[PDB]
Design an enzyme around this catalytic site. Structure first.
Site, PDB file in Angstrom:
ATOM      1  CB  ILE A  28      -1.049   0.018   1.146  1.00 26.81           C
ATOM      2  CG1 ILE A  28      -0.382   0.118   2.529  1.00 26.81           C
ATOM      3  CG2 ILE A  28      -2.015  -1.160   1.047  1.00 26.81           C
ATOM      4  CD1 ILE A  28      -1.338   0.165   3.712  1.00 26.81           C
ATOM      5  N   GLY A  29       2.170   1.165   0.208  1.00 27.75           N
ATOM      6  CA  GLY A  29       3.054   2.313   0.269  1.00 27.75           C
ATOM      7  C   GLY A  29       4.501   1.950   0.072  1.00 27.75           C
ATOM      8  CB  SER A  32      12.750   7.824   1.750  1.00 31.06           C
ATOM      9  CB  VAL A  36       3.303   0.846   4.477  1.00 34.80           C
ATOM     10  CG1 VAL A  36       2.108   0.560   5.370  1.00 34.80           C
ATOM     11  CG2 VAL A  36       4.276   1.768   5.189  1.00 34.80           C
ATOM     12  CG  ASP A 144       8.240  13.772   8.330  1.00 33.66           C
ATOM     13  OD1 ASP A 144       8.218  14.889   7.718  1.00 33.66           O
ATOM     14  OD2 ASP A 144       8.249  12.659   7.740  1.00 33.66           O
TER      15      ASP A 144
HETATM   16  C1  LIG Z   1       2.036   6.750   1.814  1.00 34.37           C
HETATM   17  C2  LIG Z   1       1.722   6.315   3.230  1.00 34.37           C
HETATM   18  C3  LIG Z   1       3.021   6.275   4.081  1.00 34.37           C
HETATM   19  N1  LIG Z   1       2.617   5.994   5.460  1.00 34.37           N
HETATM   20  C4  LIG Z   1       3.682   5.658   6.322  1.00 34.37           C
HETATM   21  C5  LIG Z   1       4.956   6.189   6.137  1.00 34.37           C
HETATM   22  C6  LIG Z   1       5.954   5.823   7.015  1.00 34.37           C
HETATM   23  N2  LIG Z   1       5.775   4.988   8.038  1.00 34.37           N
HETATM   24  C7  LIG Z   1       4.551   4.480   8.210  1.00 34.37           C
HETATM   25  C8  LIG Z   1       3.465   4.771   7.390  1.00 34.37           C
HETATM   26  N3  LIG Z   1       2.183   4.199   7.603  1.00 34.37           N
HETATM   27  C9  LIG Z   1       1.662   3.782   8.810  1.00 34.37           C
HETATM   28  O1  LIG Z   1       2.276   3.852   9.874  1.00 34.37           O
HETATM   29  C10 LIG Z   1       0.270   3.221   8.805  1.00 34.37           C
HETATM   30  C11 LIG Z   1      -0.212   2.673   9.987  1.00 34.37           C
HETATM   31  C12 LIG Z   1      -1.508   2.156  10.010  1.00 34.37           C
HETATM   32  N4  LIG Z   1      -2.366   2.124   8.986  1.00 34.37           N
HETATM   33  N5  LIG Z   1      -1.862   2.672   7.834  1.00 34.37           N
HETATM   34  C13 LIG Z   1      -2.548   2.770   6.672  1.00 34.37           C
HETATM   35  C14 LIG Z   1      -1.691   3.387   5.804  1.00 34.37           C
HETATM   36  C15 LIG Z   1      -1.908   3.787   4.405  1.00 34.37           C
HETATM   37  C16 LIG Z   1      -0.963   3.496   3.425  1.00 34.37           C
HETATM   38  C17 LIG Z   1      -1.170   3.883   2.113  1.00 34.37           C
HETATM   39  C18 LIG Z   1      -2.319   4.563   1.761  1.00 34.37           C
HETATM   40  C19 LIG Z   1      -3.265   4.860   2.725  1.00 34.37           C
HETATM   41  C20 LIG Z   1      -3.064   4.474   4.039  1.00 34.37           C
HETATM   42  N6  LIG Z   1      -0.477   3.661   6.418  1.00 34.37           N
HETATM   43  C21 LIG Z   1      -0.605   3.219   7.663  1.00 34.37           C
HETATM   44  C22 LIG Z   1       1.675   6.986   5.973  1.00 34.37           C
HETATM   45  C23 LIG Z   1       0.468   7.015   5.112  1.00 34.37           C
HETATM   46  O2  LIG Z   1       0.846   7.315   3.765  1.00 34.37           O
END
Ligand SMILES: C[C@H]1CN(c2ccncc2NC(=O)c2ccnn3cc(-c4ccccc4)nc23)CCO1
Length: 331
Positions: A28-29, A32, A36, A144
């Site tokens: 999903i992500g 850098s 994820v 951040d």
């Molecule tokens: C692009 C992502 C990067 N992301 C992060 C960047 C760096 N470290 C951690 C995270 N993510 C997280 O800790 C995280 C924790 C729990 N649920 N979750 C859903 C999604 C998500 C991922 C993609 C699209 C929508 C939602 N991401 C998370 C933050 C969101 O945007």
């Protein structure tokens, strides 16, 4: 459906590993930070996010150390962690899944030539300030704060702070790197290269998010620090010699229908002097959030608002008398 079974250590509590099985694993992500993933726990059926980063053999992961000691309704919860494996080891953080982000929600509104209803701006901003009040009470600075790192459940209106990859316990007299924080959200002391900054860099970043939700676009854009400083100066005026040492009418900045309490809150977050900015707890207590303290307040979808007043002694430690405002009579 492929099932992965790992031996993972629970995040909170003493080190007692267990077998954890998950399925429906998808990316999903990617960035850098690392990768994820989204996955479903076989036992409970619950959705989880899995942040996978490259683990250094030489030292303990700072993000993991910080996340293991965090317990707050507005901070993403670390359920488990486990190591996985050419010849390199990865740390995997199993977090509670949150489906949306403030970045994506605000972008839906921007592309549709409209702004997010002020009820949501108050709910999201209030919950972000609570999460900062909590981490800042342990001396931890996120470093951040930006819309992508603010997760949302759109149905419950719950906001959860995520991404502790830059977070650090700031100790007085210890120097810190000035290259943390994303473009548009950096406090002017970070642009000026200060290594002695405090947790108020998070308050400036939050003020940038608030102004952006009100405007429908970033308040201080620019691809260089000099361009960003020009946008800051256009709004705040030229910084005095005292202000530079320490690190335009605000009403003309926003659209005419913008609540004056929202404008007053921006002016108190976006200040040159780091010590002049509101603390997260003082921001929670601002008159812009009074509507959330009304016993008759409901979400536009008819549901009740999420938990907003379950403050702990730790959370209030910066200013305990603020509880008389923060926990309303009906709570
Ligand atoms: C692009 C992502 C990067 N992301 C992060 C960047 C760096 N470290 C951690 C995270 N993510 C997280 O800790 C995280 C924790 C729990 N649920 N979750 C859903 C999604 C998500 C991922 C993609 C699209 C929508 C939602 N991401 C998370 C933050 C969101 O945007």
């Amino acid at each position: 459906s492929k099932v992965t079974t790992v031996v993972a250590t629970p995040g909170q509590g003493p080190d007692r590993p267990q077998e954890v099985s998950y399925t429906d694993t998808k990316v999903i992500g990617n960035g850098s930070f690392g990768v994820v993933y989204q996955a479903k726990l076989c036992d409970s059926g619950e959705l989880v996010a899995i942040k996978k980063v490259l683990q250094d053999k030489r030292f303990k992961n700072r993000e993991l150390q910080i996340m293991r000691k965090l317990d707050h309704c507005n901070i993403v919860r670390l359920r488990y962690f486990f190591y996985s494996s050419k010849d390199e080891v990865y740390l995997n953080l199993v977090l509670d899944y949150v489906p949306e982000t403030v970045y994506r929600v605000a972008r839906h509104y921007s592309r549709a030539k409209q702004t997010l209803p002020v009820i949501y701006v108050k709910l999201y901003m209030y919950q972000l300030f609570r999460s900062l009040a909590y981490i800042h009470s342990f001396g931890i600075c996120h470093r951040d704060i930006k819309p992508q790192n603010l997760l949302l459940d759109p149905d419950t209106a719950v906001l959860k702070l995520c991404d502790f990859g830059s977070a650090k316990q700031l100790v007085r007299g210890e120097p810190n790197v000035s290259y943390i924080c994303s473009r548009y959200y950096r406090a002017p002391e970070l642009i000026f290269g200060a290594t002695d900054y405090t947790s108020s860099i998070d308050v400036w970043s939050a003020g940038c998010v608030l102004a952006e939700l009100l405007l429908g676009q970033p308040i201080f854009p620019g691809d260089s620090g000099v361009d960003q400083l020009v946008e800051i100066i256009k709004v705040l005026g030229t910084p005095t010699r005292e202000q530079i040492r320490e690190m335009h009418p605000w009403t003309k900045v926003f659209r005419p229908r913008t609540p004056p309490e929202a404008i007053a809150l921006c002016s108190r977050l976006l200040e040159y002097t780091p010590t002049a900015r509101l603390t997260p707890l003082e921001a929670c207590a601002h008159s812009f959030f009074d509507e959330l303290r009304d016993p008759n307040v409901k979400l536009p979808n008819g549901r009740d608002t999420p938990a907003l007043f379950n403050f702990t002694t730790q959370e209030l430690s910066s200013n305990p008398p603020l509880a008389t405002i923060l926990i309303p009579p009906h709570a």
